[PDB]
Amino acid sequence: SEPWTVLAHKKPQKDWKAYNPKTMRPPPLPEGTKCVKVMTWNVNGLRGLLKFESFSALQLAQRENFDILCLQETKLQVKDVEEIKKTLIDGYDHSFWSCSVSKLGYSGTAIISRIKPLSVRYGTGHDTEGRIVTAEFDSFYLINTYVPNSGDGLKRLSYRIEEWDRTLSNHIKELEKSKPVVLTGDLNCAHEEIDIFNPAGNKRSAGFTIEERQSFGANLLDKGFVDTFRKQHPGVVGYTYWGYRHGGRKTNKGWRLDYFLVSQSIAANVHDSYILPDINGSDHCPIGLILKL
Numbered sequence: 001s002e003p004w005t006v007l008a009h010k011k012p013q014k015d016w017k018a019y020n021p022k023t024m025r026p027p028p029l030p031e032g033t034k035c036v037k038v039m040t041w042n043v044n045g046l047r048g049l050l051k052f053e054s055f056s057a058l059q060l061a062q063r064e065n066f067d068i069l070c071l072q073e074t075k076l077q078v079k080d081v082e083e084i085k086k087t088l089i090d091g092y093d094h095s096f097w098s099c100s101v102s103k104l105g106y107s108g109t110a111i112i113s114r115i116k117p118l119s120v121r122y123g124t125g126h127d128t129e130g131r132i133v134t135a136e137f138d139s140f141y142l143i144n145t146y147v148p149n150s151g152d153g154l155k156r157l158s159y160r161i162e163e164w165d166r167t168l169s170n171h172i173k174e175l176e177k178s179k180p181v182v183l184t185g186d187l188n189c190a191h192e193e194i195d196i197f198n199p200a201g202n203k204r205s206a207g208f209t210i211e212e213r214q215s216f217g218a219n220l221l222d223k224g225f226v227d228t229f230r231k232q233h234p235g236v237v238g239y240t241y242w243g244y245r246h247g248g249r250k251t252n253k254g255w256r257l258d259y260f261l262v263s264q265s266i267a268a269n270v271h272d273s274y275i276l277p278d279i280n281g282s283d284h285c286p287i288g289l290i291l292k293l
């Protein structure tokens with residue numbers, strides 16, 4: 001059963017198809033093509049995921065052979081990182097964790113890499129909610145972020161639009177002045193109607209407000225960044241999130257909230273921006289990016 005291959009959408013256009021990674025991913029790169037492979041995942045609580053019976057860090061690494069793993073919502077405290085680092089599997093020696101210090105057991109990001117970065121900074125070193133990690137590599141910057149959820153009743157929409165969204169934009173544009181940027185993580189916005197199963201029923205839901213979508217366009221895309229999955233798959237409905245409560249994953253009633261956004265300068269180097277909807281353990285599934293260097 002592969003429910004993500006069934007086109008679930010309340011108001012689809014005529015020529016839209018459901019994303020099937022078995023038939024729609026490009027063929028592998030010619031061998032020796034120097035590239036970097038990144039996987040990104042909102043794990044909805046790292047400790048809980050590690051207690052998930054069907055989850056193994058070793059199998060995931062063996063299956064995808066990523067160089068870098070970007071996590072959101074680790075929910076770790078600072079005091080937890082030393083021990084969590086010890087459970088990292090062999091081969092991924094450089095790990096960097098930004099944990100929430102005001103609200104405990106909340107938010108949290110991490111970058112796990114078998115490539116040693118030139119530099120790593122946390123925040124835009126103030127990161128009170130552990131929402132941003134920036135790792136410098138030789139030809140690009142990798143920014144892993146967990147964007148603030150606007151919340152029930154849009155209670156946080158003002159901070160999201162007026163403060164957060166602009167600060168993230170300024171941070172990536174500043175770094176772009178030295179190297180192109182790979183922005184990834186849970187951006188907490190379904191950009192267009194194709195990115196959400198029920199657009200009409202969610203006009204005032206966090207993540208699909210007119211305010212959030214317009215900011216996404218104006219503060220991210222229109223400042224020279226490319227939605228790699230959307231560019232690679234025009235007219236393809238593919239989700240990365242399914243709400244637990246209404247059991248929408250079994251019928252693919254989901255949203256695309258997780259992205260790979262890249263500087264215009266390296267948009268042509270993206271070989272594959274993909275989704276892994278079969279991996280369970282969170283209400284998000286992982287996404288991956290294969291970038292030619």
